[PDB]
Scaffold this motif. Structure first.
Motif, PDB file in Angstrom:
ATOM      1  N   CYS A  47       0.832  -1.195   0.000  1.00  0.00           N
ATOM      2  CA  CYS A  47       0.000   0.000   0.000  1.00  0.00           C
ATOM      3  C   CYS A  47       0.868   1.247   0.000  1.00  0.00           C
ATOM      4  N   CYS A  50      -2.242   5.984  -1.373  1.00  0.00           N
ATOM      5  CA  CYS A  50      -2.819   6.963  -2.287  1.00  0.00           C
ATOM      6  C   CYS A  50      -4.254   7.343  -1.948  1.00  0.00           C
ATOM      7  N   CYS A  53      -8.764   4.129  -3.217  1.00  0.00           N
ATOM      8  CA  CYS A  53      -9.844   3.262  -2.774  1.00  0.00           C
ATOM      9  C   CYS A  53     -10.853   4.009  -1.919  1.00  0.00           C
TER      10      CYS A  53
END
Ligand code: CLA
Ligand code: CLA
Ligand code: CLA
Ligand code: CLA
Ligand code: CLA
Ligand code: CLA
Ligand code: CLA
Ligand code: CLA
Ligand SMILES: CCCCCCCCCCCCCCCCCC(=O)OC[C@H](CO[C@@H]1O[C@H](CO)[C@H](O)[C@H](O)[C@H]1O)OC(=O)CCCCCCCCCCCCCCCCC
Ligand SMILES: CC1=C(/C=C/C(C)=C/C=C/C(C)=C/C=C/C=C(C)/C=C/C=C(C)/C=C/C2=C(C)CCCC2(C)C)C(C)(C)CCC1
Ligand code: SF4
Ligand code: SF4
Lengths: 80, 75, 30, 35, 161, 731, 60, 41, 89
Positions: A47, A50, A53
């Motif tokens: 991860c 960003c 999601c």
């Protein structure tokens, strides 16, 4: 690594998985929503943080939450 | 662009613009002070910005007073 | 009128205070 | 001044030598892979 | 003469400002001949400067040592024209603008697309609502009593505490 | 953890340069460290409080040492109105020959001229010689050795205090009101009765003779017999030459009021009777709370019982005892809030009621001391609300604080914030609107069209304290009032002489220029409060981020989703209120300086006319008083103001460098560093060398902080260079 | 509640807490949040509908 | 014509008409009753 | 412990002494403290203006200073008198 949590308000729309640029998220079978699937984050080691999601999530105050934590080389997105 | 127009405005006033007497003596507007004052930041602050803003801050009650107002309004 | 020895006494008390500060700093670090 | 030589000694120590010493020690300490 | 001030009709520094401001205009008018539009413009400025300084003299304004009029706004009605009488005029107008802006919003809030009636104003409805604002202190008291003014706390969105 | 920072395993394994940066800026957040227990947390804070106390006394010992060694204190006590106080000497090898003589003007060696006021304060408390200043610097040097040993000692395992000792609120307040406040004020009364008031009376009382020289001729028998009026019998005359016995009284505890007529400073016998009365009040106040002896109040019982039966405060103050006792951030936030008020009050009262001899005649020191303590008070107030915001994230328990006065602030936080939003907008719409109105009519040649509101409410307060110039005739400016009659027997002849003297600072004459700037100050106070209150009340959550307490006090954002969430954290409202604090203290100290520089300059009517519009502040204050400063050096040479002109431009540069970290954000710079990493890996003979931490751009929160620190340092250094060189250059 | 009914949200982290929406569908399968409620005002993401449990809804 | 009247009723057109009307009478009152520093005349 | 509900606190918020005192006794004590304070203020006023009794703070008497602090004692005893009366003494 960053922390990615799935809360049970997920409707299984798969939009967070489609938005993830580093393949953290996947759909696993579930029974708590009528779509029959929930998001899951097995690969939180990749991860970058960003929050694409979180932008994709349609539920009111999102079922995916990214909690930024300990930075690694992969978490910082360094190509060097 | 700000330094370009400030280089222009000080070099023209110091070294080009001014008056000519029939003697031939050249009297420039800021007196030729570009050569010795513009080599420090203190000279740009004092001999250019502090010295030449006298006309825009003393404009009040004159016809140039709209420039004094826009000076503050743009600040 | 401060004398030469009075400046030297203050420097010795200051260098002892530097030792006590390192001892406080090492204990806080542990 | 009484001991007028003392600024000529202590100001190069506090200004040059002690910052050279302390920046070198902190640089060595932040690169240690143990504690 | 409230706070150690003087009335502007009795202060020489106000008289000196009137003399100096007319003298500056008369010096500019002296550089033009009589019938020119610069001289006719400067003659009107002298009469407007003269009418302004005589209006301030006869009108209860207190001057300081600088010769400029100071306003008193502690509440006394001997200086009501300086703050409280223009203050009633503001509150009546600004209360009107607020009341009819609130009234137009709740009027179009029950239509089908209430947001399009805010970028494209229903002008006959807005002009009708706008003239009702002249009795806004009566209708604000009536809406306060009847409950239409203040929403209940269970109807208003809030954040987690 | 191995590989520094030792206290954070997360940052210890960071591969980039972010580890060293974040290890420094989290080193004192001891509650967030790995393996931190509550008992270890208090013991580390206790020991580091001993280290901070030692640093204060080392700094005070250094001020005393450098004045005793390199200063001119003995020449200043001989001629206080003609001598410039020396801070310390200059040893700089970069100095040219003309700079050496520019700074050694009245002296042998190059010096800095002190603007801290320690000469006027040490002279007032009785210092006369350089040997006495040296012995004071030695004693503070050994006191800070003891404080460094005590911090070491109270970390040893047999001397580490238990957590219950740190939570003993009743015994700490009892001692800190008595011993720390009241006994020290009683002891300071012991100093100025025995030492300082004989030294102003021309009598030397030092350690060699203070046991055999009584401070009063009656000598302590009127104290024990209750004949206390003997200590106020004969004060110093109106023609007492200060520091000499000529015209000098013998009274040690008076209530004279006003100023000593020569020094234009407070009477030392009034300060002694002030400190003694302050001592008794605090000693009594330290008998309230229940320690080991059965009598006294229990503080949990007071808070639990104070609920108004009307129910307008819901549950009252129940739960607030356990809230404060378990939150060090709420305790620190209360402490910084009172210190910020105490530092503002220090600045506002030291200029107006001058405590030190000849302090009001040192114009640069008075400007430096007001500007110092008002900027300190701004930093303390911002930190009080910052640690109040950390408390809501980290320490606030919503179930322990159920319906008490603390929880009900979050319950109506939208009403608080939107009404602070109203008052901020009302002040700003009309103060800026009235200034622009007065700018426009003065620019068009009609200054008689200016809107000049007279500040009659504050003029009424001056007239209520006895100012006669506003001819209000109300309480102390009216000789028929019972406040004037009862009071004329005590302090009021001294006070009415001081308040009606127009050549001191006691209740300065105010007009319409003072009206508009107080409403600018009230604007700046209200907006800075609004950012800080919204920072604390929205610290746990908003509509944009309902789970914000899970993310902590400081975090960058929540991403570009939901519209965008830049600067949503409660840390970021501290960061935005710091600009509003410096702006507010800016407007305060600009107003103090320009009103004083026109009073000291002899033209107080220049402030009264030109402060009504903004161009008067720009032209008649900023542009006019910049002239000695920016001529500190020029093409024709330099003088001793050359250091302030350099610092003036030095301050402008750091301020502007802060704009870079404030405007440019991270993803520009991380892409620029990636090409620099490429260029180093592909350059021969530099390929021999490699970093051990990967070069990255500074993080989002870090450059907010770095840009704020550059903004604040450049703010402070520019005005300190200007407020000092303009007062020294003019006077 | 039934479909077509006006409900008030009691979630406290919803954008539409204390606001009125209309129930579109109620799932009968036994899922965790069966009632889909439509709103007239969009949230910060631009969404105008959300699923709720029945205890998070209050009949208007 | 219905669509043109609807364009004239859009927000910036009505704001520009109403503000020039409002700036209109404020300027015209200051022409005929200038220098009103308070309600004094 | 010291939390309470309703219109009046219980008697125990007055401490261990005044929680047992009658409301009429605490009421009369309050008037006695108010009258001593009002007498002490008025007599210190006439001692301030007497031309042989105010110099060097001779208007300050110890019994008038101690008497004037019946003012806050008159406030508290009349609050305590109300609390005992609401509690049925
Ligand atoms: C700062 C607080 C303050 C406030 C809120 C007010 C409010 C008021 N004053 Mg003001 N006043 C004040 C301070 C204040 N005063 C001070 C310090 C002075 C002495 C300079 C005055 C001198 C003054 C006079 C002479 C009068 C008022 C009056 C009034 C009233 C205006 C009439 C109205 O209500 O419409 C209003 C209640 C008028 C009034 O009717 O008082 C009852 C009036 O005649 N005031
Ligand atoms: C000089 C007058 C004086 C008097 C009469 C008192 C009386 C008292 N003090 Mg106080 N104390 C004083 C001065 C005084 N103190 C000063 C100047 C300080 C620094 C502010 C303190 C600091 C202090 C603290 C921190 C505490 C007290 C407490 C008490 C109470 C203890 C109850 C008891 O019976 O304890 C049993 C007896 C003893 C403990 C023996 C000592 C008692 C004496 C009177 C205290 C010493 C006073 C002084 C230093 C000595 C000279 C006076 C005289 C003997 C010559 C009692 C009311 C305690 C309390 O419960 O307050 C609510 C408490 O915790 N005092
Ligand atoms: C009488 C005995 C006594 C004394 C003299 C002290 C003194 C101190 N203790 Mg304390 N302490 C005591 C008993 C005592 N303690 C007891 C019994 C306990 C256990 C219950 C503690 C538990 C304790 C802890 C846990 C800590 C301390 C600390 C301190 C230090 C405070 C910091 C400082 O130096 O500023 C002193 C400041 C002044 C002398 C001046 C006060 C300035 C303020 C701003 C004045 C403003 C008020 C003004 C008069 C009125 C307001 C003005 C108004 C008009 C607005 C100070 C040395 C702290 C420390 O630093 O330890 C190293 C600390 O962390 N103490
Ligand atoms: C608030 C209390 C207080 C403070 C801050 C001072 C401060 C001072 N005193 Mg004073 N003094 C005091 C109370 C106080 N005094 C009392 C109660 C007496 C007895 C009545 C005196 C009697 C006295 C004499 C006779 C002299 C001083 C002197 C001084 C100065 C230097 C002292 C020194 O070198 O010690 C070093 C400091 C320490 C060792 C720190 C002590 C830490 C404590 C104990 C904890 C310094 C300004 C001297 C001076 O030069 O006057 C101008 C001097 O000759 N004092
Ligand atoms: C006695 C008062 C006091 C105490 C004990 C604390 C203690 C704390 N604060 Mg608080 N705070 C205070 C006052 C205080 N603060 C004030 C006055 C402010 C307003 C500025 C704040 C605003 C504040 C914020 C916003 C935060 C804290 C935080 C903290 C915690 C950790 C800080 C840290 O890691 O330090 C180490 C800090 C550093 C190493 C940074 C140094 C930066 C300095 C200022 C730069 C110096 C200027 C430069 C070198 C000059 C150059 C000169 C030029 C000519 C070249 C710690 C509990 C943090 C926290 O998370 O709490 C839990 C936090 O986020 N504080
Ligand atoms: C000079 C520069 C400047 C100005 C004018 C402002 C102005 C404002 N700031 Mg900002 N701010 C600034 C710099 C500035 N800021 C900087 C550098 C920062 C750090 C990033 C901030 C960070 C900041 C924060 C965090 C907050 C503010 C807020 C505010 C508003 C405060 C409320 C108020 O005073 O309303 C008055 C309005 C003004 C002063 C601007 C409009 C003035 C108009 C154009 C002229 C008015 C004249 C006249 C009355 C108009 C009538 C004409 C006609 C229509 C009839 C105000 C709009 C706060 C807020 O929103 O509170 C509600 C708030 O929370 N500011
Ligand atoms: C926000 C603060 C503020 C306030 C309170 C004022 C107020 C005023 N200004 Mg100022 N001014 C301001 C900001 C402000 N202005 C700004 C931001 C600028 C720069 C654009 C100016 C530049 C300016 C100039 C150049 C002049 C003024 C003038 C005036 C006066 C106008 C008198 C008038 O027209 O009444 C009559 C108008 C009305 C009563 C309108 C209402 C009409 C309705 C129909 C009434 C219905 C009631 C029922 C009034 C005192 C004039 C003046 O005379 O100075 C003394 C003037 O010449 N202003
Ligand atoms: C609005 C005014 C008000 C009212 C109605 C109360 C009411 C009360 N107070 Mg509170 N109090 C107040 C303001 C008020 N307080 C303020 C401003 C302070 C200072 C910050 C206090 C400090 C305080 C303390 C320390 C205590 C109370 C206590 C009480 C309760 C018992 C009555 C009493 O005081 O004993 C009546 C007898 C006296 C007051 C004699 C003492 C004389 C002193 C000097 C006065 C009662 C509910 C007591 C309590 O709640 O116990 C659990 C208690 O211990 N109060
Ligand atoms: C005085 C001490 C006795 C006061 C007292 O107990 O009140 C005794 C009596 C009334 O007695 C009251 O009785 C009540 C139940 O009957 C409550 O118990 C009150 O506490 C009690 O005061 O008061 C007096 O009449 C005393 C008046 C003396 C002052 C005269 C002026
Ligand atoms: C957020 C938070 C916080 C913080 C807070 C703050 C920071 C505060 C501040 C506050 C402030 C800072 C305050 C101030 C105030 C003040 C006041 C309140 C004052 C008053 C005064 C008076 C009342 C006086 C009077 C008088 C006069 C005027 C004259 C003379 C006489 C007399 C004295 C009577 C805390 C930590 C808690 C926690 C939670 C959260
Ligand atoms: S976008 Fe949200 S609702 Fe859709 S699958 Fe991902 S977490 Fe679940
Ligand atoms: S934060 Fe980015 S990398 Fe992590 S799960 Fe969300 S979209 Fe994927």
């Amino acid at each position: 690594s960053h922390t990615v949590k799935i809360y049970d308000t997920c409707i299984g729309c798969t939009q967070c998985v489609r938005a993830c640029p580093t393949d953290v998220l996947e759909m696993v079978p579930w029974d708590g929503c009528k779509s029959g699937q929930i998001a899951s984050s097995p690969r939180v080691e990749d991860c970058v943080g960003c929050k694409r999601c979180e932008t994709a999530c349609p539920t009111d105050f999102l079922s995916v939450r990214v909690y930024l934590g300990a930075e690694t080389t992969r978490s910082l997105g360094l190509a060097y | 662009i700000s330094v370009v127009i400030f280089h222009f405005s000080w070099k023209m006033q110091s070294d080009v613009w001014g008056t000519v007497t029939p003697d031939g003596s050249i009297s420039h507007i800021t007196g030729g002070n570009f050569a010795q004052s513009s080599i420090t930041i203190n000279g740009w602050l004092r001999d250019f910005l502090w010295s030449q803003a006298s006309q825009v801050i003393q404009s009040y009650g004159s016809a140039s007073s709209a420039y004094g107002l826009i000076f503050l309004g743009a600040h | 009128m401060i004398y030469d020895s009075q400046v030297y006494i203050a420097l010795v008390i200051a260098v002892v205070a530097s030792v006590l500060a390192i001892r406080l700093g090492a204990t806080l670090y542990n | 001044m009484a001991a007028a030589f003392l600024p000529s000694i202590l100001v190069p120590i506090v200004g040059l030598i002690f910052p050279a010493f302390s920046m070198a020690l902190f640089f060595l300490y932040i690169q240690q892979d143990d504690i | 003469e409230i706070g150690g001030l003087t009335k502007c009709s009795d202060s020489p520094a106000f008289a000196k400002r009137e003399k100096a401001s007319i003298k500056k205009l008369e010096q500019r008018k002296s550089t033009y001949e009589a019938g020119t539009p610069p001289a006719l413009a400067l003659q009107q400025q002298i009469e407007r400067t003269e009418a302004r300084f005589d209006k301030y003299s006869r009108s209860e304004l207190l001057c300081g040592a600088d010769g400029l009029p100071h306003l008193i706004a502690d509440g006394r009605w001997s200086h009501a024209a300086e703050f409280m009488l223009p203050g009633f005029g503001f509150i009546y107008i600004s209360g009107w603008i607020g009341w009819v802006g609130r009234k137009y919003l709740r009027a179009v809030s029950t239509t089908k697309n209430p947001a399009e009636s805010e970028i494209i104003i229903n002008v006959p409805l807005a002009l009708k609502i706008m003239t009702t604002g002249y009795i806004w202190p009566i209708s604000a008291w009536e809406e306060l009593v009847s409950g239409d003014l203040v929403a209940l706390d269970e109807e208003v969105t809030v954040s987690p505490r | 953890a191995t590989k520094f920072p030792k206290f954070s395993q997360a940052l210890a394994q960071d591969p980039a340069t972010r580890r060293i940066w974040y290890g420094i800026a989290t080193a004192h957040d001891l509650e967030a460290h790995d393996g931190m227990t509550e008992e270890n947390l208090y013991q580390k804070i206790f020991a580091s409080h001993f280290g901070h106390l030692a640093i204060i006394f080392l700094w005070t010992a250094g001020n005393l040492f450098h004045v005793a060694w390199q200063g001119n204190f003995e020449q200043w006590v001989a001629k206080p109105l003609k001598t410039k106080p020396i801070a310390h000497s200059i040893w700089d090898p970069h100095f040219g020959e003309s700079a050496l003589k520019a700074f050694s003007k009245g002296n042998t060696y190059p010096v800095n001229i002190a603007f801290s006021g320690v000469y006027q304060w040490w002279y007032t408390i009785g210092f006369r010689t350089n040997q006495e200043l040296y012995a004071g610097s030695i004693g503070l040097l050994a006191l800070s050795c003891v404080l460094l040993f005590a911090g070491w000692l109270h970390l040893q395992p047999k001397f580490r205090p238990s957590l219950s000792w740190f939570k003993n609120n009743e015994s700490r307040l009892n001692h800190h009101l008595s011993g720390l406040l009241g006994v020290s004020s009683l002891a300071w009364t012991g100093h100025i009765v025995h030492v300082a008031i004989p030294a102003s009376r021309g009598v030397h009382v030092g350690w060699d003779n203070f046991l055999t020289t009584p401070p009063h001729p009656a000598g302590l028998t009127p104290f024990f017999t209750g004949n206390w009026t003997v200590y106020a019998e004969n004060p110093d005359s109106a023609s007492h030459v200060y520091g000499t016995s000529e015209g000098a009284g013998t009274a040690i505890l008076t209530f004279l009021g006003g100023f000593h007529p020569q020094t234009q400073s407070l009477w030392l016998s009034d300060i002694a009777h002030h400190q003694l009365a302050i001592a008794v009040v605090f000693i009594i106040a330290g008998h309230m709370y229940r320690t080991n002896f059965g009598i006294g109040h229990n503080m949990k019982e007071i808070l639990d019982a104070h609920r108004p039966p009307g129910g307008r405060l819901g549950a009252g103050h129940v739960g607030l005892f356990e809230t404060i006792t378990n939150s060090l951030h709420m305790q620190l936030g209360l402490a910084l809030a009172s210190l910020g008020v105490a530092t503002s009050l220090t600045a506002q009262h030291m200029y107006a009621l001058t405590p030190y001899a000849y302090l009001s005649k040192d114009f640069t020191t008075e400007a430096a001391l007001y500007t110092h303590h008002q900027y300190i008070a701004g930093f303390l107030m911002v930190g009080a609300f910052a640690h109040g915001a950390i408390f809501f994230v980290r320490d606030y328990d919503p179930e322990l604080n159920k319906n008490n006065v603390l929880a009900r602030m979050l319950e109506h936080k939208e009403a608080i914030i939107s009404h602070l939003s109203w008052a901020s907008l009302f002040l700003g719409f009309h103060t800026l609107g009235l200034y622009i109105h007065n700018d426009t009519v003065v620019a068009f040649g009609q200054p008689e069209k200016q809107i000049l509101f007279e500040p009659v409410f504050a003029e009424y307060i001056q007239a209520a304290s006895g100012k006669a110039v506003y001819q209000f005739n109300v309480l102390l400016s009216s000789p028929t009032s019972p406040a004037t009659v009862a009071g004329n027997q005590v302090w009021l002849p001294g006070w009415l002489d001081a308040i009606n003297n127009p050549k001191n600072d006691l209740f300065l004459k105010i007009g319409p220029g003072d009206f508009l700037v107080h409403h600018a100050i009230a604007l700046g106070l209200h907006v800075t409060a609004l950012i800080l209150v919204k920072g604390a009340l929205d610290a746990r959550g908003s509509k944009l981020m309902p789970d914000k307490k899970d993310f902590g006090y400081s975090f960058p954002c929540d991403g570009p989703g939901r519209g965008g969430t830049c600067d949503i954290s409660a840390w970021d409202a501290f960061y935005l209120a710091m600009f509003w604090m410096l702006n507010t203290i800016g407007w305060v100290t600009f107003y103090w300086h320009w009103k004083h520089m026109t009073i000291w300059g002899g033209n107080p009517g220049q402030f009264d006319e030109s402060s009504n519009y903004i161009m008067g502040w720009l032209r008649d204050y900023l542009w006019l008083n910049s002239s000695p400063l920016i001529n500190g050096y020029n093409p024709f040479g330099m003088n001793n103001l050359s250091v302030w002109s350099w610092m003036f431009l030095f301050g402008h540069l750091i301020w502007a460098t802060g704009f870079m970290f404030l405007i440019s954000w991270r993803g520009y710079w991380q892409e620029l560093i990636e090409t620099l990493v490429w260029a180093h890996e592909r350059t021969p003979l530099a390929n021999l060398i490699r970093w051990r931490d990967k070069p990255v751009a500074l993080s989002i929160v870090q450059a907010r902080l770095v840009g704020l620190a550059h903004f604040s340092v450049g703010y402070i250094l520019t005005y300190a260079a200007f407020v000092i060189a303009s007062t020294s250059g003019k006077f | 509640v039934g479909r077509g009914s006006k409900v008030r949200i009691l979630r406290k982290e919803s954008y539409w807490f204390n606001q009125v929406g209309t129930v579109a569908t109620i799932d009968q399968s036994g899922i965790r949040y069966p009632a889909l409620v439509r709103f007239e005002s969009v949230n910060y993401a631009g969404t105008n509908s959300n699923n709720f449990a029945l205890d998070e809804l209050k009949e208007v | 014509m219905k669509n043109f009247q609807k364009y004239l009723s859009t927000a910036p057109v009505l704001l520009t008409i109403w503000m020039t009307f409002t700036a209109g009478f404020i300027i015209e009152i200051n022409r005929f009753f200038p220098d009103m520093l308070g309600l004094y005349f | 412990d010291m939390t309470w509900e309703g219109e009046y606190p219980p008697s125990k918020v007055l401490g261990p002494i005044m929680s047992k005192m009658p409301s009429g006794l605490l009421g009369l004590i309050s008037i006695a403290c108010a009258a001593v304070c009002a007498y002490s203020i008025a007599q210190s006023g006439v001692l301030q203006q007497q031309p042989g009794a105010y110099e060097n703070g001779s208007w300050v008497k110890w019994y008038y200073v101690l008497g004037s602090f019946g003012g806050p004692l008159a406030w508290g005893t009349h609050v305590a008198s109300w609390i005992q009366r609401k509690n049925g003494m």
